[PDB]
Design a protein around this ligand. Structure first.
Ligand SMILES: Cc1cc2nc3c(=O)[nH]c(=O)nc-3n(C[C@H](O)[C@H](O)[C@H](O)COP(=O)(O)OP(=O)(O)OC[C@H]3O[C@@H](n4cnc5c(N)ncnc54)[C@H](O)[C@@H]3O)c2cc1C
Ligand SMILES: Cc1cc2nc3c(=O)[nH]c(=O)nc-3n(C[C@H](O)[C@H](O)[C@H](O)COP(=O)(O)OP(=O)(O)OC[C@H]3O[C@@H](n4cnc5c(N)ncnc54)[C@H](O)[C@@H]3O)c2cc1C
Ligand SMILES: Cc1ncc(C[n+]2c([C@@](C)(O)OO)sc(CCOP(=O)(O)OP(=O)(O)O)c2C)c(N)n1
Ligand SMILES: Cc1ncc(C[n+]2c([C@@](C)(O)OO)sc(CCOP(=O)(O)OP(=O)(O)O)c2C)c(N)n1
Ligand SMILES: COc1cc(C)nc(NC(=O)NS(=O)(=O)c2ccccc2OCCF)n1
Ligand SMILES: COc1cc(C)nc(NC(=O)NS(=O)(=O)c2ccccc2OCCF)n1
Ligand SMILES: [Mg+2]
Ligand SMILES: [Mg+2]
Ligand SMILES: [Mg+2]
Ligand SMILES: [Mg+2]
Ligand SMILES: [Mg+2]
Ligand SMILES: [Mg+2]
Lengths: 582, 582
């Protein structure tokens, strides 16, 4: 049973009830930054012997760290901020967690209840601000509600389609004395009654039947499969269907595998987008048919029967209309379909080697390619060397931009939750704090933040967090001195007319600005810069072998372009396969 | 103490908890119309021996009756409707109660909690629909909340500025068994901490001082004074300040009194609007400076020091900027100012007989006047005869239109809560149901609905309610066969071009259509029609002397106009004092 630090008849502060509510959820780590409206919560945290606090240097760092914790572990991430300016600094993280379906519980202090609505000191209506960028939120109006609301928040954040839940706690409720009741029933009758049931054998056998009748099936795998790598891998054994993955699904099926078509979509491989373009059966498991993937919807999988299995009924038929649909956990659907495939194996005689051979011809004519100019370091090459020296077992977090795409293309993720990247919102500054959360959740792992120079500086203050918490976070900084992805679009569509994409100092144009090594130096983090491709392998090896945190500044020619590229709203026939800024 | 019909350890349905919650509030009458989602509440009502239900024939009749009950008694009116179409039929009454600050508690049944949001049978999101036309509303999500929410609803409806509160109760909560806790504390910390305090002697003596320094003071009295007739009357004794009343304030100060300037505003008396126009001190007690009263705001009381005493801080300075302000109960402000005036009486030497004489000259040159054409019945005359034959002691309710203004002008209300009229929203069909509620709340009173033919037919179905409940409701129907007030504006501003204002039958143009006597006949209510002014006095006398309900159809020439008239947005110099539709 659970052991409380208080007697069952002993009144204690609401802040102490809230912390014990976290303890009763199995919480061991929080990311909490103190302020006036949350001082009581922070005092109660020091009284907890089972919950560790990682103090960020910015609440956006706190929420992004909670995301990295969640994405790398499957557990909910918990961040805590004070009222007013603390709460508003969470907003980008809440939106990011909602768009990527990341389970997250955010607790904000609030001004006393009687002060609400009066423009009080450090008051913002955070429940109103965040209603459209959270899965649910609460304003606690009585200390007796703390056990129930915390329980509901964790249940909502982690069940169904996961997402962020914000709990706003007025300071007077934190100080009120009460005796908690941990037996209160949750008040989610509508939500709980609309929870998907395990899929029926009726629907599952229709799918297995559709597979046997098809000649060109393609698996279309996304973020919803992160807990189904075993079931999915078994499914691929029994069917031999090639696997195309989204940015969010990377690693659900191993990238180094022969049946892997790698990533599809705007910057997906030519052969992955080819497969979807010419398929007759599209198995869309745990995906939401977003515009980065589909392009022009009418042309996406235009001659395929579309099977869509999603745990969110609101996603089924939202953009692309499926032929067959299953609303439920893809993990269960895979388990059920795997049994059918095992028994009726010899009756089905599944063989797609002719389709696979057609795709492997595309895989040989159009592989992912990069150019090497003299001794300049290709960013693609740097990530490939990191893959080798870490044996593809590192947890990878990124910023947003060209380096993000290259980290997606040129690292072979073997398991899900190695890949931590902001996909739906695409928020710069995510990589460094996310690596902080992933390292705390996986203390023995290799954690590398593959960051861009614009993204890295946005939350550079979290270097102090990495040092103080003694986290072995590695930073592989692909430094092209530009806002690279926006620069690439300037080259393609605006005649290379630069509009504020250069991040260096124009007074000293040929100097690396700023000097990221001194940012690491300021926080006592060893660092180095590498410029010549000949030095890169030993440089990365040094970063990995040096215990504790390390920053490697990898200088790269800025004229590189992420390829291939299907322009926004385009079709497969519009794919760009050559060119850069030279 | 209170005696429950259940043992303190005996579980009972939520519906039974809700009814006992009403009993514990002192509720004796409700206006409840049954439907599927509220059947449990109606079953629980039959188990109550202290609460009577008056079954309307339309839920709009139910809410309007609850209004009449409230306006005529000072107690909150309680109406109950089922989900969906029952709840939506309350909407006009909720808006009407909010605009006129009438205390009201509306209970709606709702579909089961788990069905909410699914377009279920007879489901409408009534809490969303009514949020902007109620003072507050609730969606009960647990049977344990019923005692607390009902207590908060009555507290909010009746404290501060009164208003309607809607409580939405899902059917599954009505059926759930529980043991109520009647000791729960309310959760209104912000509202209760912002409640006005009793006025300080600091503010009150500044006002008494401002009175002594003024030569032309005018009292400007409205709906906020309905509980202050004694204090106000005493205040007028000590100061001799003449009293101008709004439509909502009629009867706070007696109309037959010599210091009474009667009603001000768009259809106010020439002398009341004169006083405000030339005053140097305007005592605005319990008023909200609405556009019907002020006209062009810059010209309203343009040379007066304005004292505004309102219980709602949001009203002070909303339209007209006062010089002095007191946020609090006008009843207490009057009591405090009366003490100062009593003690410092001989030191003040208050005498405004010169100003009063100037106003009494206006009162003699421009009195309220009407014309008599042959034997046709002037509506103004009919109301004056009703005043005499009832000695000004009848409770009067009205519809909306010309007859409403005439009932305001030509009846001398002696006490507040004799005058029940929809002022802010101006909802036709109010008069008949309001009379129903007033009669139930005042069983021994003379209750007369002075109604128009358009207004009366809108809720004519409540005649069945009057008969079945055996209520002595008198109907003085001023029948001009037109939508009279809109007709008057057609005459003045649209060259008498009729645009759907005629309510009779054009095929039989000179026939009274419809025959309201047969409407009364259908419901077993004695009725009569009078056409000649010579017959009017005996006709009204018959209506009054005949026990029980009675309808008197008073035929009137339609070309009458309500005078005087300050056009909308005009000034005192724009007042119209002559003309009609002839
Ligand atoms: C600069 C940039 C470029 C990008 N370009 C690309 C690109 O070329 N290709 C690309 O793929 N992405 C790209 N993206 C990422 C992108 O915008 C989206 O994040 C991604 O494409 C959508 O991922 P998804 O389809 O797997 O759905 P997700 O966002 O991962 O959501 C999961 C889906 O599965 C469902 N689900 C969740 N759990 C379960 C379960 N247990 N069972 C069943 N269903 C479940 C959810 O309801 C939801 O519909 C890019 C992002 C950036 C920032
Ligand atoms: C066809 C038609 C014509 C009309 N023409 C006129 C007209 O010529 N003249 C006219 O006067 N009206 C007219 N009206 C009515 C009108 O539109 C308004 O209802 C009325 O003028 C406003 O009443 P009020 O100023 O007393 O404020 P109310 O609506 O009665 O509200 C009361 C005010 O006092 C405050 N208050 C409440 N309780 C207290 C308390 N205990 N202590 C202190 N303050 C308190 C409230 O906050 C509020 O500000 C007409 C209506 C109709 C339908
Ligand atoms: C908080 C935030 N602000 C601005 C953004 C708009 N974007 C991008 C995009 C694609 O989302 O535009 O739609 S990418 C990008 C530039 C990235 O600079 P880098 O870190 O150096 O990486 P690289 O390897 O050089 O490309 C910008 C400015 C963004 N997403 N987040
Ligand atoms: C629900 C409703 N619908 C329409 C209305 C618009 N109005 C009016 C007004 C002033 O509010 O117009 O602004 S008054 C009026 C006509 C009144 O017909 P009567 O009952 O016969 O009385 P009378 O003695 O003849 O004048 C209409 C149509 C209204 N207020 N309520
Ligand atoms: C420099 O002022 C500081 C500084 C610090 C460190 N702490 C606080 N704490 C409070 O002021 N607490 S409070 O009484 O409940 C309160 C009353 C009114 C409005 C807000 C409010 O809380 C805001 C949270 F700060 N104030
Ligand atoms: C002709 O159908 C009728 C008729 C009558 C007289 N009563 C009811 N009652 C219910 O259906 N009750 S319910 O099971 O809780 C229910 C379930 C689903 C949706 C709404 C709902 O309630 C709506 C209220 F009617 N239905
Ligand atoms: Mg089929
Ligand atoms: Mg090479
Ligand atoms: Mg860059
Ligand atoms: Mg003064
Ligand atoms: Mg006469
Ligand atoms: Mg009429």
């Amino acid at each position: 049973t659970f052991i409380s630090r208080f007697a069952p008849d002993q009144p204690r502060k609401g802040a102490d009830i809230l912390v014990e509510a976290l303890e009763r959820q199995g919480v061991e780590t929080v990311f909490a930054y103190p302020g006036g409206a949350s001082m009581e919560i922070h005092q109660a945290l020091t009284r907890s012997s089972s919950i560790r606090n990682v103090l960020p240097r910015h609440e956006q760092g706190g929420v992004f760290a909670a995301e990295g914790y969640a994405r790398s572990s499957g557990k909910p991430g918990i961040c805590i901020a004070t009222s007013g300016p603390g709460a508003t600094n969470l907003v980008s993280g809440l939106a990011d967690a909602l768009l990527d379906s990341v389970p997250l519980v955010a607790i904000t202090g609030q001004v006393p209840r009687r002060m609400i609505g009066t423009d009080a000191f450090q008051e913002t209506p955070i429940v109103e601000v965040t209603r459209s960028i959270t899965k649910h939120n609460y304003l606690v109006m009585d200390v007796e509600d703390i056990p129930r609301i915390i329980e509901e928040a964790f249940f909502l954040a982690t069940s169904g389609r996961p997402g962020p839940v914000l709990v706003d706690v007025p300071k007077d409720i934190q100080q009120q004395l009460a005796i908690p009741n941990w037996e209160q029933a949750m008040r989610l009758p509508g939500y709980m009654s609309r929870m998907p049931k395990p899929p029926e054998d009726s629907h599952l056998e229709q799918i297995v039947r559709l597979i046997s009748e098809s000649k060109k099936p393609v698996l279309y795998v996304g973020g919803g499969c992160l807990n189904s790598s075993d079931e999915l891998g078994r499914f691929v054994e029994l069917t031999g269907i090639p696997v195309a993955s989204t940015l969010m699904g990377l690693g659900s099926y191993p990238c180094d595998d022969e049946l892997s078509l790698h990533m599809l979509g705007m910057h997906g491989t030519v052969y992955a987008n080819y497969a979807v373009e010419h398929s007759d059966l599209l198995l869309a498991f745990g995906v939401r048919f977003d515009d980065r993937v589909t392009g022009k919807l009418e042309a996406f999988a235009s001659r395929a029967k579309i099977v869509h299995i999603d745990i969110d009924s609101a996603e089924i038929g939202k953009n692309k209309t499926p032929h067959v649909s299953v609303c439920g956990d893809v993990k269960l659907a895979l388990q059920g379909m795997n049994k059918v495939l095992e028994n009726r194996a010899e009756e089905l005689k599944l063989d797609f080697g002719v389709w696979r051979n057609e795709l492997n011809v595309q895989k040989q004519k159009f592989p992912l390619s990069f150019k090497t100019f003299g001794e300049a370091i290709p960013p693609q090459y740097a990530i490939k060397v990191l893959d080798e020296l870490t044996d593809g077992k590192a947890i990878i977090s990124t910023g947003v931009g060209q380096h993000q795409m290259w980290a997606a293309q040129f690292y072979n993720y073997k398991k899900p939750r190695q890949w931590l990247s902001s996909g739906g919102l695409g928020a710069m500054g995510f990589g460094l704090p996310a690596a902080i959360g992933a390292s705390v959740a996986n203390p023995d792992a290799i954690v590398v933040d593959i960051d861009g120079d614009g993204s890295f500086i946005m939350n550079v203050q979290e270097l102090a967090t990495i040092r103080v918490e003694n986290l072995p976070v590695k930073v592989l900084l692909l430094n092209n001195q530009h806002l690279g992805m926006v620069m690439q679009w300037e080259d393609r569509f605006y005649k290379a007319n630069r509009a504020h994409t250069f991040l260096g100092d124009p007074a000293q144009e040929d100097e690396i600005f700023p000097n990221m090594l001194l940012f690491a130096a300021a926080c006592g983090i060893p660092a180095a810069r590498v410029t010549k491709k000949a030095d890169l392998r030993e440089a990365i090896q040094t970063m990995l072998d040096t215990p504790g945190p390390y920053l490697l500044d990898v200088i790269c020619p800025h004229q590189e372009h992420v390829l291939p590229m299907i322009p926004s709203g385009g079709t497969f026939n519009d794919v760009i396969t050559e060119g850069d800024g030279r």
